[PDB]
Write a protein that binds this DNA or RNA. Sequence first.
RNA 1: AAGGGGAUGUUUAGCCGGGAAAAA
RNA 2: AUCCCAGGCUGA
RNA 3: GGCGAGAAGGGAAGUGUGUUUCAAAGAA
Lengths: 382, 190, 211, 50, 259
Amino acid sequence: QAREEQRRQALKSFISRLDDLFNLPHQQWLPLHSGAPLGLSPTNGRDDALSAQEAFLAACRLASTRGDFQWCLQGLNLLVNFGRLRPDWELSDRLMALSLHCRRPEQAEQLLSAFPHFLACPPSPVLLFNLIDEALAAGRPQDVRRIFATMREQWQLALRPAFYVAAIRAMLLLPTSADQSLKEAQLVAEDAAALGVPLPPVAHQLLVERALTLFEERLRQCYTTEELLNLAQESHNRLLVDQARDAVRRHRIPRAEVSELFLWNRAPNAHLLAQAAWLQWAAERFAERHNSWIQLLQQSCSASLQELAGSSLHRGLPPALLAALIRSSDASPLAQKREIVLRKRNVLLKERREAAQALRALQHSAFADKLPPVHVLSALLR
Amino acid sequence: CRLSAAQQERVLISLPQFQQYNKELVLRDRHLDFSPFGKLFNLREPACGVRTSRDVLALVKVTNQHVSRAMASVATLQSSVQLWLSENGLRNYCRELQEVTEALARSSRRCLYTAIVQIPLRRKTWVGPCQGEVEWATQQALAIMEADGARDRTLSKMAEMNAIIQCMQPERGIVAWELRNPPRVVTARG
Amino acid sequence: EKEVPPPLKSGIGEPKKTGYKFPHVFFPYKSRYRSPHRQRWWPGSAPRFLLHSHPKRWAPRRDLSFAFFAFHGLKPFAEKNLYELMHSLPLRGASSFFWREADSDPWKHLGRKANRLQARGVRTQGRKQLVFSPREIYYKRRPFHALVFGRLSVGQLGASSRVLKHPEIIRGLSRVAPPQASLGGWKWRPPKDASRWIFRPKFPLPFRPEL
Amino acid sequence: EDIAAAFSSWTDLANATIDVLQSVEGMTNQQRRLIVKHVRLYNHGLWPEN
Amino acid sequence: QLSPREFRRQSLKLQRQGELFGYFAGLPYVSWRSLLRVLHLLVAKPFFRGQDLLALPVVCKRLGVSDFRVVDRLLAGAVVRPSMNFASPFSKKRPPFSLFVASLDDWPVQHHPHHMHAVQRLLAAICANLHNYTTPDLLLLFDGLTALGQMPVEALEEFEVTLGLLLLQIRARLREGGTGKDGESFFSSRNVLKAYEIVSRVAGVPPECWTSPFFAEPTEGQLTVQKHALAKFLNTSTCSPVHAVEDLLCLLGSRILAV
RNA sequence: AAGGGGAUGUUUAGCCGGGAAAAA
RNA sequence: AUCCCAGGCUGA
RNA sequence: GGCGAGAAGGGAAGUGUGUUUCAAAGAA
């Protein structure tokens, strides 16, 4: 209590002293700067005076409340009116930090949107990320959309794939329907692709996982199944292209041919192969329903074992894929027209065989430790 | 980094006293001790240890990035769990996980804000030219080169360098949009 | 109540002034004397640049906010000047092309003298304008005061409002301060060889703008 | 509209004198001067092609 | 430790010997006079030898010298005749080009309509001088650019375009091949293997910019120099960079097939 | 998302001329 | 003495 | 931003005001 009162009085007194000194003639004002060499000897007369901006920041150090932020604004207004302000990275970053410290996120967003009119430099990307994090924490991921749009439109804020990833995850986190959230994330990712910004693997992995989860939900009985499949395929191709670009930046007959491709491949990635196998399975299932991925899954298991023996991507086995595999393996035999029923039963038996083979491969895979035995089956039974 | 009551009384009581001793409120690295910062950061030998408030800032930034990315991972995990629920021990664990992660993220963000606000203003560690000096010196050097060229008006490499410079020059010309000094035309005797 | 000149005020970026105790140098013995430096406050007049325009802005700290400092950049089209327009543009508006309209100046519409006899008559009914491209920019008081230089030339407006087509029909001067930058209605166009990195395309709009 | 009603035809308006213009009800000195100037300009072919 | 006045006085000999930036760093204080002398030397003679080449980007970044004109002069001097300044992988110790390119990571340029980093200006310089490079120089530049030992997203596309142009030019020169047979003889098994390894870095997953209309809305100012180089190559000498990569890999593999 | 959310970031200095305030 | 100058020149 | 603007002065002054007789060149 006493300490808080003392610091508030110090802040108010500092502001009032600045105001009075400004009211006094200009020859008695605090200097704009501290002086340069030729107009310890070398260090003499370099930084030996309290500039008006330095005094303002020192007073701002005393502010820790949403009311003290307004006294800080008064100091800034005094500096602007009397022309003792020289905007720079220090001023921008410290104003943003003052707003965040005083817990004025709305004022922080206003600074983001208003700096180009009266400030030379933009706030720091770390502080922009912290603002995004606070928006996420406050249960308002939608604010991330507006903030990222403002950042991207602003020419002085450079484009960074981390911001794209944060925006995509926020869009997926929006409190709306899953299809709508996926559509928003797709909009953000398409903006990134149109501009030509190679995103990290994790963003495309999130996109493909969402698309395939919706695809499985639809096939259990905004976007159609074809739309979801095409979105997943496009996102995976973008993922591969972006991985190649990042690497450069940082320095049946086809069924048989798959074996040769894998044999001559240097060192595939377990998670990428798992996603590719899931995409292949989804494509095959959709084509059959309208009317092999087992190799890819086995290769993914082998690659996982190889990696265990010896980047910025999400590591794990999609639980949606696990649930789909378990449901397929649990295909009950009961579940012109008679011929169609026989064909459907044959297709279901084929799917059950493929699911059983996939489960057998995953048991020996390095992902087995992530799947507790007889857990998905119990969840389905319950 | 904050002002003490002694200073608040000595230099903030009245305008005459503020004008008498305002130079005392110049917080520089020489007025800080980093031993407690090193102790709180551990940094046991042979680690370098804290030597500047900027190093403190860098360490806090690294911690903040780690905590924030952990929070993002936990958030997406909870989103997936909510999706599965829409389609228990999961949420029972996630409640505590999110609580602890959010508390840690808030602490890290507040630490970053406080560091940015309190750390003294950044000044050149050595005695070197400022932005205005650099700008004027570059303009003067270019003017001197042009004046010497006009005065003149193994060299094959120089000729090739001139040719590449001409082929690389932007057609419209120089676009100086953030001049440090008011616009000026510098010259030289040649 | 009577309409009288507003009190004199000092501009942003300057110390206060003491003022004078009587309006002009003849008060009150010559009541019809008008000073050349008198502030133009009546409707249909443009306040003088850096003398009576841009007065010091003071508000109670209750209402202060960061938007309070964007007033000069948010000034409307008829009032916003070239420097205020340029401050919040890519590369501070440099490498782009600027031209003034003048069709919305306050005197042409408001005031007692707005409607008066003209040497040619009253209006009953493509254009060659003056185009300025900045090259050197330096703000003395952001965003409304700057010392700019650039290329002045003769352009070619056309039907879209009007759109610049050939900013370089005739070469004018290669380095001059902008004409009529003090105030007016300015329009700008980015260069043909624009980069998407600097001139950021508009962020896609949300598919479902939920309330 | 009242001035137009007072002036029955373009011939009357063009050949009217300052006395008739003043006699017209509701016409001010500025309006009379404007009408005179524009009538002369049109008769001389300097308006509306101004 | 030399006095700054004497450092300025002997700066010419210090440059001519390659021992200038070390003395500059060791000077007590840097004033406007010393800064002006250094900048005048940089602009007048942008050629440096020895450790000066590696110290130049670091010294410029420390001082704040980011004028695009000076940066372009320095990069042009560096990339003119690289074989006489940088280590040549083909068979005292000239430094490698990978370190030089990595040293430009955080060296921005100022007062340019389209570019913000020294990487873009270096790419423009190599594209501009592309027509005069010999095969060993082209291979050295390519290896330095793509060596393993962060480029900005903005300059990534320009970097990819420059790589494509370099691949096309090396393909053309090798296809062109008395003097040709002497060059082939100079190209031994070691050199062929080194070239194969160098090209193998870009072998695989060609950048989409290669298939983009650039090598097939006016072209943006970012790639104006790349467009100029492409037009010059097309008129003086159509082969896509992907096809050039395939041809180079096939030729080198055939040569290898015949420590 | 182990690793760019990283790093770099003191003020151009004089002379003349004109203007305003304080003082006189 | 450093508040302003749509006023100027200079610094190897 | 540029030109013009004294409600068209009787408020000072006696050897003054005014009157009469003269004289007044840049581009040297």
